[PDB]
Design a protein around this ligand. Structure first.
Ligand code: CL
Ligand code: CL
Ligand code: MG
Ligand code: MG
Lengths: 504, 504
């Protein structure tokens, strides 16, 4: 019955929405969706980076169940997902962009090109417009628009600017020529062809790096603007808190954030990071405008009040916090993501803001509930429908839970550095309103008193006065571990009258 | 190349072997196997009751991975096991007795009789002689031996004795007519037909209850004999230690231990339990005799020095300890099991006794190593081959690990009583030489100082002086949970050159 529109925009911070009180950041179209919908203020990714993070999103599972530890980790073919379930509800789930699903290699022919990347399409989606890392479909679209220069990703370098340098200058393409504008247009054309209830997933790359954007967004924000950075006085002191920080922070490269970047991101100053943030803030504004354009096209076709809109991000961005750029680790900056759900079918909950901890694992259970679908296996998340109704679900979680795995199957760098097996190269986070407890399978734990230290700069795990707090969170995490074991078959019992099952 | 003989005898205590220094118990044939083999002194079941315990044994997985929680919990069809692997090594794995495998109901026709019981056969085994709970095959064999009275399981009631009463009188059948004597004979006939390397699993019911045995075993031991019972002064003080004990202990029924038993086992006195133990000790002797008959049969055909023998039990028996009878819970009595491996291929370890912690989860990895087989998925156990070689494996575990789940899918009794969801009706045990830490997903934890309290009667979890010990074991258990997550696909990374994998 309703149309479903799942919109994701990569690497977008949960605190970077004007609707949540950001000083600098301007998100009017997200705000507009939240005015008529439910905004989730404590929404966390299941994990990081893109492939592990998206496996939570699409399967409704914690990394302890989906087992997608890194970009390139296969996702078991046994797992149900929102695309496959959508089809059991009579929809044809359609993709615009990417899912970053490494397929299950088992049984697949060794010569199959699908075995060579993590940039595969999630089973169940029908691809209308694909757009991988190579962006060849966008480049060819630019060529058809009068850009014979659009022959490579080099087109991302701002006009006249030095390759690999932070620049406020706009690239050769316009604001109506970004990958965002391209994908939105492709969605809008497809939307025009619809004559029945539709299911679409639009996956925008931006505000994910390279950090370059056309006019006006490039200069829309001043480097001096923006909130304080949640960081230690210096990089050395920051890294001294935990072995993982000492290992990971020096390895962050410039190439990952600026097109043509060379060397360590450690060579960028507080000023350089502030300049990057100004561009990032503009990039968020560019995606927001495109969302407005999507809202209008929905109204124009008369879909607006028949469409369940879910806007979110896979994982977020550190953006200078803790002298870091990118995703991964255990800090809030990398995991706290936006979530705005506009359900015209539940007007009761319109205008509301939810302060209960929510997970990316909750999206698939929400869709199942709302669309009257039954998942084919255990799910880790819970339905958000009671929050959309304007109420609160019974037995809801009281802390955010997420995981991060830093194993290296291909090169074994982290394993050699730490002197650990690949199965001990991980952490689990339990985070509520007062504390953050990080447990590492093979490194020391971390405990942050968010009341005293909201910036997470003081590890109090070894302080004797926090010993009982540390023990409490360790045992809470132990119950979470035990409760989230796979219940796919464990909720069934074979009796004399045949199988008997329980509903979660 | 070698023959494989996996022998299991249900509900046999690890301390009940004369080779380990038991005062009363007489196990000469197990001792004889151990004299020429490796005996494992700290061997623990992966879990209990029979179906959960056997899933660890056959799949080399901890319950956190196989998810077989209760008798009736399905075992996922995706899992590899010692019988499927044996076929990949050119063997025809043959079964005598039972595996207690509830099949994966998915895709199976709802009218299939296999969906009505947990007493299914493990995939990969070819059944030579089946013997389920109904024992109809043994009853018909008795009829053919001149027992027209053998028309029902009533034949287990001792001659003249009152049904449901502890009796040291022998039943109508002889020592050469037990289920043990029947199955051993069937194995011996099959053994004679072998002309190539063979793979057999002989699964004996005894010393599992009803506690009745023919002459001489019935009176071979005096109730007054036997070691001290590891129990509190009374049942009430026992049950007061933990909510699970207060729930479970009153529910133990007489029918589960004596044929025709009625009412609670709480109505049995210290004397009654000592009488039951005397019969149990005799039942162990009856099984040991049949092992000697098997060892002779192997010598007679010339297989003895070409056969890898693995003798063990699925789980143990409480046998009066903690005022309990049967299996389940968290006490040692229910999980410490025998393990004797005779490998003629490794004479370098013969006569040896191993004191490191071993698991039922280690059997399948051991067979894979020894027989040059590769498992099709992640395994939780480790190869015991380095111990058979006469050495020690590098990076072996410092503590025994086991789990127990008490959910009730069919009736929901435990769930209602405790006010817990089915996913929270479980515990995990971490047990070393000095401490036992039992964490419950939804009940209070337990901490036993085995150095001061080897009988497990004093819970010190709440004592402020043990706070750091409690924290240490909680974080150690957290590390295990993270390391034992499914690595089937997580040890693979999809690269430009295709898949790249790591070996555990
Ligand atoms: Cl600032
Ligand atoms: Cl062979
Ligand atoms: Mg991403
Ligand atoms: Mg058993």
């Amino acid at each position: 019955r309703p149309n479903v529109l799942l919109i994701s925009a990569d690497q977008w911070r949960g605190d970077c929405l004007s609707a949540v009180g950001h000083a600098s950041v301007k998100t009017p179209n997200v705000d507009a969706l939240a005015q008529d919908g439910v905004l989730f203020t404590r929404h966390f990714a299941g994990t990081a980076p893109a492939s592990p993070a998206r496996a939570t999103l699409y399967t409704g599972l914690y990394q302890m169940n989906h087992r997608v530890c890194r970009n390139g980790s296969p996702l078991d073919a046994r797992f149900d997902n929102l695309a496959l379930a959508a089809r059991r509800g009579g929809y044809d789930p359609t993709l615009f962009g990417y899912t970053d699903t490494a397929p299950d290699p088992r049984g697949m022919d060794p010569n199959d090109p699908h075995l060579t990347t993590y940039e595969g399409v999630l089973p169940g989606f029908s691809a209308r417009q694909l757009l991988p890392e190579h962006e060849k479909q966008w480049l060819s679209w630019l060529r058809s628009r009068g850009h014979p220069e659009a022959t490579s990703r080099d087109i991302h370098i701002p006009v006249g600017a030095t390759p690999g340098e932070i620049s406020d200058v706009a690239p050769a393409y316009s604001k109506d020529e970004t990958q965002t504008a391209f994908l939105a247009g492709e969605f809008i054309r497809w939307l025009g062809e619809q004559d029945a209830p539709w299911f679409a997933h639009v996956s925008f790359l931006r505000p994910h790096p390279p950090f370059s954007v056309p006019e006006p967004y490039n200069r829309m924000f001043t480097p001096s603007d923006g909130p304080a950075f949640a960081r230690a006085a210096n990089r050395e002191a920051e890294q001294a808190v935990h072995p993982l920080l000492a290992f990971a922070l020096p390895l962050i490269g410039k190439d990952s954030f600026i097109y043509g970047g060379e060397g360590s991101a450690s060579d960028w100053t507080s000023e350089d990071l502030s300049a990057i943030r100004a561009i990032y803030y503009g990039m968020i504004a560019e995606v927001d405008t495109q969302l407005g354009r999507i809202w209008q096209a929905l109204k124009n076709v008369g879909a607006w009040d028949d469409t369940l809109i879910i806007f979110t991000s896979d994982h977020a961005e550190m953006m200078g916090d803790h002298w870091m750029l990118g995703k991964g680790g255990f800090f809030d900056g990398s995991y706290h993501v936006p979530l705005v759900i506009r359900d015209p079918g539940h007007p009761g909950g319109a205008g509301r803001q939810v302060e209960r901890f929510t997970s990316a694992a909750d999206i698939f259970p929400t869709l199942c509930d709302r669309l009257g679908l039954v998942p084919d296996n255990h799910l880790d998340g819970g339905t958000l429908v009671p929050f959309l109704e304007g109420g609160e679900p019974e037995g809801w979680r009281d802390a955010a839970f997420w995981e991060f795995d830093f194993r290296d199957i291909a090169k074994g760098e982290a394993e050699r550095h730490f002197g650990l097996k690949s199965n001990a190269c991980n952490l689990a986070v339990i985070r509520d309103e007062r504390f953050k407890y990080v447990h590492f399978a093979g490194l020391p734990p971390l405990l942050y008193d968010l009341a005293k230290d909201p910036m997470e700069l003081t590890n109090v795990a070894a302080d004797a006065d926090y010993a009982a707090v540390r023990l409490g969170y360790a045992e809470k995490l132990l119950s979470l571990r035990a409760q989230h074991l796979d219940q796919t078959l464990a909720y069934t019992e074979l009796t004399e009258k045949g199988p008997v099952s329980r509903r979660p």
